[PDB]
Amino acid sequence: ENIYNRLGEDLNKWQALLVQIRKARGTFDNAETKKEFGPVVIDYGKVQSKVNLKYDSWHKEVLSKFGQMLGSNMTEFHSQISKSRQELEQHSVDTASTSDAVTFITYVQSLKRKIKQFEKQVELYRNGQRLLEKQRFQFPPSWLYIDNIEGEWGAFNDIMRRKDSAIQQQVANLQMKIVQEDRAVESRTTDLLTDWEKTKPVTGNLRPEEALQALTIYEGKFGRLKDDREKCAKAKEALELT
């Protein structure tokens, strides 16, 4: 517990500790059982064997601490591939609700960096598991093996860069759709303006309740117009190509 707390969560530091203990054991290797100095005889082999057993047991149990977050990385593998299947089957150039599609496009650009991070994590994981088989690990049946996940992850990356890029270049249609949407929004804003100066109930002869209802209708449609304008602006800035 003390050494684990001192190390904390660090896979590379863990591998450094593993190579340190491995080289310490390698240096410890010896055949003599008694170190003779003058007429003095000292037992050396019994404690040697006991502490070699100590080294072996501690090294073995330290290895067991690693099977956990590897399970975490396989869970990451699954959450990537299973969700990505539906995500790649989801979007298309049509379905003018593309404000959601461009949201997913921004999501996948944001996840490019996470994909790179997970790739270097997979590199560290493959080094660690290589250590694991050269440390004679009995592979559990429910353990998901390295080559399966690496192959399916490479396939995931290939499909992602094959399809998500393609749908990204053909955006000029989406660009002109956003253009016509925003010019319609501007026209509606000008119309709402003209309606505002025409509708000014600032005169007090009007009944407060009826003019209040009229202003409530105007404010409902004006909130709708503001929602349209803000959603067009957010779609434009998320797509960020126009």
Binding site: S82, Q138, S142, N148, G151
Partner: protein
């Protein structure tokens, strides 16, 4: 029981189905001795279990490249035998 340790060399599955594949191939190996018959047994069991249709090969030296259904690919080893099983059809 001969503890033939299983290693899975490429798979797009869930872990339960991968371990079921390991168990089915182990039972086939303990049951038959003909690689064609081993493939027949494992593929028939898989068609009965997770619906048709599968494709399986049993051998010691064979390299493969195949397109499969998503979440329906596996390739593992049992002893000195390579066990591939994909779903396309």
């Amino acid at each position: 029981m001969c503890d033939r340790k299983a290693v899975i060399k490429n798979a797009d599955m869930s872990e339960e189905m991968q371990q079921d594949s390991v168990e089915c191939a182990t039972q086939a190996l303990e049951k038959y001795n003909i690689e064609k018959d081993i493939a027949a047994h494992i593929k028939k069991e898989f068609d009965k279990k997770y619906n048709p249709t599968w494709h399986c090969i049993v051998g010691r030296n064979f390299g493969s490249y195949v397109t499969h259904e998503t979440k329906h690919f596996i390739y593992f080893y049992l002893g000195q035998v390579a066990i591939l099983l994909f779903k396309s059809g």
